[PDB]
């Protein structure tokens, strides 16, 4: 049939985008469709009419009414145009027809956004951490415009409209100083082609209501400058010296005034030594770079500039700057550097309710993921609980999402495909993104409706009836809980220094604290309750427990891993689209299954040498033995299920992975070679036996 699509209101980006992204959906149902804002030619009809203003009451909102063969969008913004159009395309893919249900909404959390890392597996040489140009030999993916327009068509789709690149020193790949043109850590003609590609990301971003974010880290300089004056490119023991803020601030000036549509996303850290010094760095370096930028432009705006608690005090330092600049945003880790919990609590909470109390926008970000890595997660249930908690607890109202896994071997995944051909996160990762930009929008969605709503996306995704795909999300809400409960129950640290999915030795469940915890951890990252080392003294001294218990945990989570397997399971025989993907969401499930069981295990070997330390019955030891032999037979077989489908665990491939083993030089990335030192931890605890009974 012919269908019109009237564009009214001020001709914008973002409603020429609204307009041409509704045409070619519905071209691709199979409708004719009139562009026209001719009441002589305006036979069915959508009229898009984008509003002037309406302020913060009315940002990103739209209205949808229907009378018969009518429908009329109302975009509060250029935003709320594009969400309404989505509003439709959304109704159109899950009907097949123009029967549209009148709508009026707008999003809870005000941004709601991922970041991409320009960051690297290992440090380049003559690098520190962090520290990468630029470059097509480093990022050849950075340079692909197609590739950028499925990124931020996939954020459009998922109503994200924030995107965050991370990189330790961007400034010397990006903006040129006369004053110290040495500095420049590129070339010529890269610098031209890194010039093109923020012009193009800045501008294909705005038409889709995105902002582009640049973070960096500090204090850290370009190589060349760093060169020129015979000084460390970053080193956390070095004081603020006059010439660096001078380079820092002339280089943030320049930003400002060379991409003046981008926000800054700064930390102060990782390598400033003190507080004083990030407040003194952020104050009188960082943020007068601004303010230069801005008059150089004529802007008397203060655009958001947004600050991150990680390795400050992010509440001292907003205290210091206000008086400086009002706008300023925080953000704050959700669970440490992992995914442990939708029921925080405990100092970490405290942080965020106080950073949320200074009443701008508070950003929660669900950062690195850990103790994910590098199996497929997007668990509805867990995302939405953990939306909610990121209100209730930490009074968070915008979002900040890492990539699910593979931070930093962006743009791809570790599975190993058959053709040495690299999976794209993009396509893997699509129901990550879609659950947190789901309930960013909207967080308290009754379940029993959300249930319906994943079963029809799995299904579709998977070409299997919605009652059929109920299987997938089942998985996913089962495999979903193990590395959270895990990670928190038995975790050295939510951070990337660890690796849960390689497994832990014995040793780091019977002395924890030999392999360094941090206050903060246990007291934050869910419910209260006792470590193993904890609930067998309290055994032995007939004290009472309380809280989540660590043998209650190891039995929900292989119950998990029973659930998952079985349901995903029931699903290969019929899906009719993505096949090869669903072979490879079931190999993950029982990965998690048997990683599960080896896990059990070997807290149970734990529990009985605890026993054997506080009453000396050998008996516990030699009771030990077979339960190491079972969780050695389980971990066997996950070496035989990664083997041929994933290139390694850990993306940050360097000695600062410690647990459960050091990753220096990429080392112990692989089961394979886990498996290796789980042998011999075996081995050495059957001569230990020997020696204590002789
Ligand atoms: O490695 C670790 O345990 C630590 O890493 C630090 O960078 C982080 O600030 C801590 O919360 C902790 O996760
Ligand atoms: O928050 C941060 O920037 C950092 O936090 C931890 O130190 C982590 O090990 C780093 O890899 C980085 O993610
Ligand atoms: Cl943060
Ligand atoms: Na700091």
Request: with cysteine; aromatic share 12%.
């Amino acid at each position: 049939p012919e269908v019109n699509v009237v564009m009214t209101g001020d001709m914008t980006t973002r409603l020429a985008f609204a307009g041409e992204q509704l045409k070619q959906a519905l071209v691709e149902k199979g409708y004719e469709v009139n562009q026209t804002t001719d009441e002589k030619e305006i036979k069915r009809s959508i009229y898009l009419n984008l509003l002037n203003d309406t302020t913060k009451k009315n940002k990103e909102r739209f209205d949808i009414s229907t009378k018969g063969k009518n429908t009329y969008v109302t975009g509060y913004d250029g935003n709320g145009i594009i969400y309404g159009c989505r509003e439709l395309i959304d109704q159109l893919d899950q009907s097949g027809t123009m029967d549209f249900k009148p709508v009026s909404d707008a999003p809870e959390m005000v941004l709601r956004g991922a970041c991409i890392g320009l960051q690297k597996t290992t440090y380049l040489p003559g690098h520190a951490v962090y520290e990468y140009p630029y470059t097509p030999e480093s990022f050849p993916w950075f340079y692909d415009k197609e590739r950028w327009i499925k990124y931020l068509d996939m954020m459009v789709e998922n109503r994200m409209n924030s995107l965050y690149l991370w990189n330790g020193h961007p400034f010397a790949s990006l903006v040129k100083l006369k004053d110290y043109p040495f500095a420049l850590e590129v070339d010529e003609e890269t610098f031209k082609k890194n010039e093109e590609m923020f012009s193009f990301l800045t501008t294909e971003a705005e038409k889709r209501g995105i902002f582009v974010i640049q973070m960096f880290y500090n204090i850290i300089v370009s190589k060349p400058f760093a060169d020129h004056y015979g000084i460390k490119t970053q080193d956390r023991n070095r004081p603020i010296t006059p010439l660096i803020s001078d380079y820092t601030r002339k280089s943030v000036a320049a930003f400002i005034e060379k991409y003046p549509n981008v926000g800054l996303l700064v930390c102060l850290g990782e390598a400033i030594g003190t507080y004083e010094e990030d407040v003194e760095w952020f104050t009188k370096t960082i943020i007068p770079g601004i303010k230069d930028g801005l008059k150089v432009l004529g802007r008397t705006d203060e655009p958001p500039v947004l600050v991150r608690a990680h390795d400050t005090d992010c509440k001292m330092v907003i205290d210091a700057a206000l008086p400086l600049y009002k706008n300023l945003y925080t953000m704050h880790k959700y669970n440490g550097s992992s995914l442990t919990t939708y029921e925080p609590r405990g100092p970490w909470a405290k942080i965020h309710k106080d950073l949320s109390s200074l009443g701008s926008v508070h950003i929660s970000n669900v950062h690195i993921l850990a103790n994910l890595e590098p199996w497929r997660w997007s668990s509805p249930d867990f995302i939405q609980k953990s939306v909610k908690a990121m209100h209730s607890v930490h009074g968070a109202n915008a979002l900040h999402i890492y990539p699910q896994a593979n931070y930093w071997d962006w743009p791809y995944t570790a599975d190993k495909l058959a053709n040495g051909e690299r999976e794209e996160q993009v396509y893997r990762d699509w129901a990550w993104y879609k659950a947190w930009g789901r309930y960013a929008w909207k967080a308290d969605r009754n379940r029993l409706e959300e249930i319906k709503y994943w079963d029809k996306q799995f299904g579709d995704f998977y070409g299997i009836p919605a009652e059929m795909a109920d299987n997938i999300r089942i998985a996913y809400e089962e495999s979903g809980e193990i590395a959270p409960k895990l990670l928190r129950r038995f975790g050295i640290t939510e951070g990337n220094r660890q690796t849960l999915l390689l497994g832990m030795f014995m040793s780091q469940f019977v002395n924890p604290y030999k392999y360094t915890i941090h206050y903060g951890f246990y007291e934050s990252c869910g419910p209260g309750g006792e470590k193993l080392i904890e609930y067998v003294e309290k055994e032995w001294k007939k004290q009472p427990h309380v809280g989540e218990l660590p043998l209650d945990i190891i039995n929900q989570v292989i119950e998990h891993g029973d659930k998952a397997v079985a349901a995903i399971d029931k699903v290969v025989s019929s899906a009719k689209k993505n096949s090869d993907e669903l072979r490879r969401l079931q190999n993950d499930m029982h990965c998690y299954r048997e990683y599960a069981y080896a896990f059990y295990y070997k807290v149970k070997a734990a529990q009985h040498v605890l026993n054997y330390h506080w009453g000396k019955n050998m008996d516990e030891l030699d009771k030990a033995v077979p339960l190491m032999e079972e969780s050695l037979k389980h971990y066997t077989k996950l070496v035989d299920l990664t083997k041929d489908t994933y290139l390694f665990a850990n993306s940050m491939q360097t000695a600062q992975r410690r647990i459960p083993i050091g990753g220096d030089d990429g080392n112990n990335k692989t089961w394979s070679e886990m498996l290796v030192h789980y042998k011999a931890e075996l081995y050495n605890f059957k001569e230990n036996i020997e020696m204590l009974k002789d």
